[PDB]
RNA sequence: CCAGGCCUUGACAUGCUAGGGAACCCGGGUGAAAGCCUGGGGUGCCCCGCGAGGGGAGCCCUAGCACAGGUGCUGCAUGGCCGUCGUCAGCUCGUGCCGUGAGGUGUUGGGUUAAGUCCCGCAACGAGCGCAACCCCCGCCGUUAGUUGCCAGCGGUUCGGCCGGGCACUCUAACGGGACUGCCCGCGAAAGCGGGAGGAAGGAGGGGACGACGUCUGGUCAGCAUGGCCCUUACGGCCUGGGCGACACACGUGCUACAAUGCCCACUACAAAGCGAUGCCACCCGGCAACGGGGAGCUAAUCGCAAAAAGGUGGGCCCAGUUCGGAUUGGGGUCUGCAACCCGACCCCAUGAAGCCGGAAUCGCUAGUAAUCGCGGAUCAGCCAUGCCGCGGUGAAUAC
């Protein structure tokens, strides 16, 4: 019954993190929200030009945002179209029960 | 030198990465490194076509390269001929799903990768350095642009002396992130040397 | 029969619940005095309740996550000074001139770099 | 103490264990 | 030091050569590049040339030296002193 | 000793000890992180350009 | 880098000539390894193919030619990137006016601000790069969502939010709101300044990101790029060992201290940010211990790292070169790794140095700051990390 989703930019995590909500709250029956679980944060500090300079650095940070639905009530009308569902390229799901 | 990379500036509010996948710790890497390879390849054959940006994309063993270009024509090839001829080569090195498309450039003027790379080559040719710049920025402003900076370093005429010589014209605000600017760089080779060549067009704050 | 208010300060979050009673306190499953003993900068997180004159008439069960005994302290004593203002809003008079009402922002400030801490400078030689 | 290995606050500061800091 | 549990540690290539000449009867030179050996029973009374990096130097081996390493007795810097 | 380097750095070794990271675009031998394959200077030229998948400046 | 042993289209790219057979895997002699010598084993295609046999070319081997290769020199020929003055309030442009001309003007002048900030004035009128704003973190509230997170209520409760049950609360993480000198008194021509209120927040809210034209013929040919100059059985390359870790001395940045506002032992609390499938490793057992053998959970808000530590309670030490301090060495072990002699970390027994608060001189910090306390991460087999990048706990003094 089980729906996770992950990827690197959330306002696409949100977008279909809500659409795969939508489909099953369609077809049947029950949906246990979008929760937004904690982000997994690596961050990278590096000296900025090519030799010495230690005092000065530069940060970069990759956010793998979190999320988690629940189809609770299936009803095997969501097991044929969520198979076929538009899905952007920067995420992830995996599918449990 | 003290000046930041306006493009990484401006990531996730004015421009977007030209690699949109998700990976793992434990296979980012070797993804990575194919989109260095390919993007390679591609500018070896495709600069002479004119490109401007080149966007890949991913989901499992499937990847649709983007690329975007200033003579769609010689892209594609005779009849859907060299855009062919590349997708096997592609996937020669890819090993899956190369799905290679080619799209339209609506102004190679109003495109800063492109403004600075005919730059780079006008001074290849031995042409005039300081009115080759006015005239490059004379371009991007005829084409109804909002601002235009061109910049070149090196041995300008093959002076001994190197000098940084430059143009400006409109607005050009680098400290403002709701302002969209494209930067463009372009590495000119010569006889006495290399000479380097920086684009930034401003098109339109959001 | 229960007043909240939400109490934060630092790290520390506080959970603060009011209850007409004898006067008995009580945080994370411990008496008052227990869980803040020795602590002589606890006594002054039952401050708001000098401020209205409520020292014996609740009672209170509160949680506390985050910060220390300290931090956990003011968030507290914000908390039950908030749910003081829900239990009688004319109770608003007589607790900003204390300031227990406001809340302050004051945190631990960012390490940066090129620095010891956030701002303690590496020493410096000349000749 | 920090430097002292053969004490509790000493193993905390090398951030091991033995007789002196158990676990 | 070197984990009681595994081995004592000998180069496999030099301790044959020991072994070889044990049963001839010892003993010619031995050129070796084994630092990381350990002086071990059989090698007493032989004459070992270890390389310091730069030389071969002629150690003989005793009853007391034993359970050293090899490279304790090359010595692989030159130091007179100062001034 | 240059390219010779980043050519040994690939071919399986004598040892497994002897594994050491070159950065896989510029081939350089120090500050070489496992995640992207980069070195610090790469890292940063990279990921400025927008070709890092997912990365942005901190700021906080 | 140095000593020694070695390789010549070469450790590597793109081409051609011809020989083998293509390819790939297994071992052998010798030698420190490299290398040099060697013993094995079967090619697709598409083809005349019941037949000797023949090549194309996926590829390896071999004698050559191109050409490779150079962290060799030049940052005083260079691109790029960075430091720097300086987060300083500045630097210019168009046109007009002024001067023979360099140039001036505007940008000066009054006032105001963190600011070329805004106002007022003016042969000036506007425009630009900077300031500020737009972006991130934090402080208040809201909408949405309720598991792995939370438990206010009730009921069960083996006595653990453990089960029912719920999303109220803490939280998690996206989208909004809110602050603007907007209101009041007042001083002001104005911009603003002092004060008052409401409010979680007040006059840039705290911090961050962000660095003008230029300066330093600044730094980096050793990250990379690159002109040129230089080498070619070697200034290229492969290896084994050593050096980069030396030590009469001098300096920079640090760590731990000289102690009682302290040291030590037992019991006992409250964080955050991170990290983790030959990875973190609950728990059990062997061990004084480092560790070792078992073995469960966790692609991780679930499981683990994990104890946070200063703190609190109790007890000991009693002013001593000491129950301060933990260098130096002797002896014995664990682990990582092919290998810890030079030259790793850690554990244990013993050894217990200097040092009694530091000469001339000199550094940092204006508030959740300094001081003090622990925790993590990158690199990474292990580690010389007391370094660096972060994170919370406690938490000042002072600015006439
Ligand atoms: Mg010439
Ligand atoms: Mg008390
Ligand atoms: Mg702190
Ligand atoms: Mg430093
Ligand atoms: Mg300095
Ligand atoms: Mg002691
Ligand atoms: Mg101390
Ligand atoms: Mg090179
Ligand atoms: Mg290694
Ligand atoms: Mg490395
Ligand atoms: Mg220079
Ligand atoms: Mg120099
Ligand atoms: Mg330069
Ligand atoms: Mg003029
Ligand atoms: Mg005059
Ligand atoms: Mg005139
Ligand atoms: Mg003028
Ligand atoms: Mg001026
Ligand atoms: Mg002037
Ligand atoms: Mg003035
Ligand atoms: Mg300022
Ligand atoms: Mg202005
Ligand atoms: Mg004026
Ligand atoms: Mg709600
Ligand atoms: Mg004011
Ligand atoms: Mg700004
Ligand atoms: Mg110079
Ligand atoms: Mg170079
Ligand atoms: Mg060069
Ligand atoms: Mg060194
Ligand atoms: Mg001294
Ligand atoms: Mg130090
Ligand atoms: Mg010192
Ligand atoms: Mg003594
Ligand atoms: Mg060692
Ligand atoms: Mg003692
Ligand atoms: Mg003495
Ligand atoms: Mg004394
Ligand atoms: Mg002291
Ligand atoms: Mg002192
Ligand atoms: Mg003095
Ligand atoms: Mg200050
Ligand atoms: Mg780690
Ligand atoms: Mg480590
Ligand atoms: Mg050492
Ligand atoms: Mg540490
Ligand atoms: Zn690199």
Known sequence: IRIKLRGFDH??????????????????????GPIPLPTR?????????????????????????????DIINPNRKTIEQL??????????????? | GNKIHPIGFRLGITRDWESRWYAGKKQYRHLLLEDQRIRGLLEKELYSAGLARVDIE?????????????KPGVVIGRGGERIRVLREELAKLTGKNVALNVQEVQNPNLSAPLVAQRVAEQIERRFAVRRAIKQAVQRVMESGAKGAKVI?????????????????????????LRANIDYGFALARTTYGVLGVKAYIFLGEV | ???????????????????????????????????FQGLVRAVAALEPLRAVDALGHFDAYITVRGGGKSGQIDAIKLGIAR??????????????????????????????????????????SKR | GKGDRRTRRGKIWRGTYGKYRPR | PRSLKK?????????????????????????????????????????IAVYNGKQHVPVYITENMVGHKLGEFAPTRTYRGHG | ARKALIEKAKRTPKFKVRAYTRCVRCGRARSVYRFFGLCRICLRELAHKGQLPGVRKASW
């Open chain 1, 11 to 32: 306002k696409t995590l949100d977008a279909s993190a809500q659409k795969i909500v939508e489909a099953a709250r369609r077809s049947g029956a029950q949906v246990s």
């Open chain 1, 41 to 69: 944060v690596r961050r990278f500090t590096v000296i900025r030009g090519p030799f010495k300079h230690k005092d000065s650095r530069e940060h970069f940070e990759l956010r793998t945002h979190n999320r988690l639905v």
């Open chain 1, 83 to 97: 198979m076929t569902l538009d899905l952007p390229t920067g995420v992830e799901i995996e599918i449990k029960t």
């Open chain 2, 58 to 70: 991913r989901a499992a063993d499937n990847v649709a390269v983007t690329v975007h270009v200033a």
């Open chain 2, 152 to 176: 070149v370093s090196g041995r300008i005429g093959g002076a001994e002396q190197a000098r940084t010589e430059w143009a400006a014209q409109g607005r050009v605000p680098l400290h403002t």
């Open chain 3, 1 to 35: 029969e229960q007043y909240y208010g939400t109490g934060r300060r630092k790290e520390a979050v506080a959970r603060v619940f009011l209850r007409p009673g004898n006067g008995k306190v009580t945080v994370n499953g411990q008496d008052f005095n227990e869980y």
């Open chain 3, 83 to 124: 749910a003081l203002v829900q239990y009688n809003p004319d109770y608003r008079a007589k607790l900003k001139p204390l300031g227990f009402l406001t809340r302050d922002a004051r945190v631990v400030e960012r390490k940066k770099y090129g620095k010891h801490k956030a701002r303690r400078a590496p020493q410096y």
């Open chain 5, 7 to 47: 081995g004592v540690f000998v180069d496999d290539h030099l301790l044959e050569k020991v072994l070889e000449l044990n049963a001839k009867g010892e003993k010619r030179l031995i050129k070796t590049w084994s630092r990381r050996s350990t002086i071990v029973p059989e090698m007493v009374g032989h004459t």
